[PDB]
Amino acid sequence: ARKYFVAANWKCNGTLESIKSLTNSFNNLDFDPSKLDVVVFPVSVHYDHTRKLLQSKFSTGIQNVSKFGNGAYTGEVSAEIAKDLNIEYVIIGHSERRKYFHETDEDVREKLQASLKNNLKAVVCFGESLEQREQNKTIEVITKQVKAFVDLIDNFDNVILVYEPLWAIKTATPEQAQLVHKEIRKIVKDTCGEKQANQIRILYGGSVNTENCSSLIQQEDIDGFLVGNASLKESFVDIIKSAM
Amino acid sequence: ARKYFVAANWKCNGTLESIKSLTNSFNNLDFDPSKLDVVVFPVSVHYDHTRKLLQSKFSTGIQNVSKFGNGAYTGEVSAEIAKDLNIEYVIIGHSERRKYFHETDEDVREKLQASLKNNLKAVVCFGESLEQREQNKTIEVITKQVKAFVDLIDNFDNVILVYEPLWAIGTGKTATPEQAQLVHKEIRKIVKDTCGEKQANQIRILYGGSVNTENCSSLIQQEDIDGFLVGNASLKESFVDIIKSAM
Numbered sequence: 001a002r003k004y005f006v007a008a009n010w011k012c013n014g015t016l017e018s019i020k021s022l023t024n025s026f027n028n029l030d031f032d033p034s035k036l037d038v039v040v041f042p043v044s045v046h047y048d049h050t051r052k053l054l055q056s057k058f059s060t061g062i063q064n065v066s067k068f069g070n071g072a073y074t075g076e077v078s079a080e081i082a083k084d085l086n087i088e089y090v091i092i093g094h095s096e097r098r099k100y101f102h103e104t105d106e107d108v109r110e111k112l113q114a115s116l117k118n119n120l121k122a123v124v125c126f127g128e129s130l131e132q133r134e135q136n137k138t139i140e141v142i143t144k145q146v147k148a149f150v151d152l153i154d155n156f157d158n159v160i161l162v163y164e165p166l167w168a169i170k171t172a173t174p175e176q177a178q179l180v181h182k183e184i185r186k187i188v189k190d191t192c193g194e195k196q197a198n199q200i201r202i203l204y205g206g207s208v209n210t211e212n213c214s215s216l217i218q219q220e221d222i223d224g225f226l227v228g229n230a231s232l233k234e235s236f237v238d239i240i241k242s243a244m
Numbered sequence: 245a246r247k248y249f250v251a252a253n254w255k256c257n258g259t260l261e262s263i264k265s266l267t268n269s270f271n272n273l274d275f276d277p278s279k280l281d282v283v284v285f286p287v288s289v290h291y292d293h294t295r296k297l298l299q300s301k302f303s304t305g306i307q308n309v310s311k312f313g314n315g316a317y318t319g320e321v322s323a324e325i326a327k328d329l330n331i332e333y334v335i336i337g338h339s340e341r342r343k344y345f346h347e348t349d350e351d352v353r354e355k356l357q358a359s360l361k362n363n364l365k366a367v368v369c370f371g372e373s374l375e376q377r378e379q380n381k382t383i384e385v386i387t388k389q390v391k392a393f394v395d396l397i398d399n400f401d402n403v404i405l406v407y408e409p410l411w412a413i414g415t416g417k418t419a420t421p422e423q424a425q426l427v428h429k430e431i432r433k434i435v436k437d438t439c440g441e442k443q444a445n446q447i448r449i450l451y452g453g454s455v456n457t458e459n460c461s462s463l464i465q466q467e468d469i470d471g472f473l474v475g476n477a478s479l480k481e482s483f484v485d486i487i488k489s490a491m
Contacts, residue, residue: 012310012317015328044288045306045321045329062289064319066256072475073256074340075308077289084259085289094318101319102346228316 004217004243005037005160005201005224007123008231009063009091014046018232023053025234031244033057037201037224038240039089039123040231044077047087061089064097065120067110079111079118090115091226093125093145095164105148112149112159123226124149125205127164127180134167138180143187150191156199161188162226164205172206174215174222181221210235213242248464248490249281249404249448249471251367252478253307253335258290262479267297269481273488277301280490281471283333283367284478288321291331305333308341309364311354323362334359335473337369337389339408349392356393356403367473368393369452371408374415382427387434394438400446406473407431408452419453421462421469428468457482460489 019042031038039059042050051060066076082090092115093108108124115122126145128138146161153159163180165172181202189197201223204216208225216222224243230236258266263286275282283303286294295304310320326334336359337352352368359366370389372382390405397403407427412419428449436444448470451463456477463469471490477483 009318011315012312012320012322012325013314014325043321043325045291045325045331047289048292068256068344070257071255072340073344074253074335074338075288075345076256077287078256081256081258081287081289087289091318096316096318100312100317 001198002201002223003035003037003157005039005203006240006243007039007041007203007224007226008236009041009094009226009228010043010046010232011063011096011228012043013232014043016046016049019046019050020053022232022234022236023050026058026237027053027055029237029240031057031240033059036240036243041089041091041123047085059088061091061121061123062087063091063094065090065092065111065115067107067114069114079114079120082115082120083118087120089121089123091123091125095125095127095166105145109149109152112152116152116154116158121158121160123160123162123203125162125164125226127162127166127205130167130170132167139183142180142184146184146187147191150188153192153196153200156192156196157201159200161200161202162205163202168206174212174219177204177206177216178219178221181219185221208239210238213239217242246446246448246470247279247281247401249283249450250487250490251281251283251285251305251333251450251471251473252483253285253338253473253475254287254290254479255307255340255475256287257479258287260293263290263294264297266479266481267294270302270484271297271299273484275301275487275491277303280487282487285333285335291329303332305335305365305367306331307335307338309334309336309355309359311351311358313358323358323364326359326364327362331364333365333367335367335369339369339371339410339413349389352389353393353396356396360396360398360402365402365404367404367406367450369406369408369473371410371452374411374417377411383430383434386427386431390431390434391438394435397439397443397447400439400443401448404448404450405431405435406450406452412453421459421466424451424453424463425466425468428466432468455486457485460486464489
């Protein structure tokens with residue numbers, strides 16, 4: 001029922017040369033974008049380059065978006081500016097922004113609202129710490145992170161969730177991932193409704209590579225991934241192939 | 245000297261079409277980039293579009309830069325990436341980043357360290373609040389802010405200071421050219437105290453309050469005001485007359 005969703009998070013990496021090389025190798029992968037979503041998230045200043053080098057079967061987005069609209073917000077990219085550039089997706093709430101730049105649940109909410117106001121699709125990240133999982137607080141913490149923003153979703157094809165097992169940076173088994181994914185879908189069901197919950201894509205955002213992608217994707221409540229370091233290698237196409 | 249320096253901070257504003265329009269109008273102004281620096285700072289995602297459309301006499305830059313290098317830093321743009329793209333200038337410590345995104349003196353320092361380490365030129369902003377000005381803390385505050393980072397400066401043409409009179413932004417108070425000049429004088433003294441006289445006389449100190457076509461000449465003709473980081477007025481085609489005040 002749910003369309004699989006494979007995302008490349010390049011984070012803060014890339015040169016124009018390397019992007020030229022990587023995008024070319026990606027273009028050589030034959031896949032149908034009506035059946036599978038494949039999204040590339042370059043660094044802001046690399047977006048136009050990346051978009052021009054990637055064939056249209058690859059969707060594209062940016063790794064952050066402002067909680068503010070246009071105006072006196074130096075260094076920010078608004079949802080309105082992204083929409084004008086036909087930027088399709090935004091990443092919101094990535095653990096590294098919550099960690100390094102003190103992004104809160106409320107910031108995530110307001111970024112999501114702004115993104116949805118301007119008709120962007122949103123990739124929304126959350127997940128518990130090692131200390132939180134060690135205290136058996138996974139459901140508590142994820143209920144709270146999800147309820148911060150979940151009522152803003154009207155179209156459950158246009159918001160994609162991402163579970164980051166920050167506890168593991170330990171290493172999460174496919175079954176352990178699946179178990180949280182199921183818990184998340186139940187949270188969505190009880191906050192938004194059962195049809196909504198069965199629509200929404202929930203991606204795994206722990207460490208995904210060529211050797212574990214098949215085991216992860218086959219899990220019933222794992223609908224794809226947000227891929228970190230493996231997405232900077234030409235063998236990312238094999239991770240893509242696991243979802244086809 | 246000192247070479248004037250006129251900078252367009254477009255902040256979070258612009259469309260593909262408005263920039264097309266605006267850059268074209270700017271291109272019609274004939275100035276000599278060896279006689280003054282004219283720098284445009286678009287939104288990161290507008291950098292390529294903006295750099296392509298502006299004639300090469302215009303310098304360009306980005307409104308923020310990361311304190312971290314390359315790696316697992318989602319949403320960040322490194323000094324490394326800016327260097328690879330020949331992005332010449334970066335803004336650091338803008339009051340709007342200190343206000344909304346909790347950017348600290350330490351953040352400013354590391355961003356400057358990272359920028360200079362990667363051969364970027366930095367436009368660095370600081371300034372006191374209403375409450376600080378009212379309590380006569382202007383020099384204490386500015387001295388603290390500048391001392392966060394000034395020892396990193398390795399070339400006093402390549403780092404540019406911006407005084408933001410935050411006490412006069414959105415407060416109901418307006419800073420006079422005379423008041424501005426005095427803070428700039430205060431700032432050049434601070435640099436002379438910490439770096440030396442030649443260093444202090446070399447460095448551009450730009451005014452970062454509200455600048456428009458009416459007040460621009462009154463500001464830049466002041467002895468210690470070497471140009472400006474312009475906000476809302478740099479979104480208009482009439483910005484060319486702000487540039488003209490420095491020609």
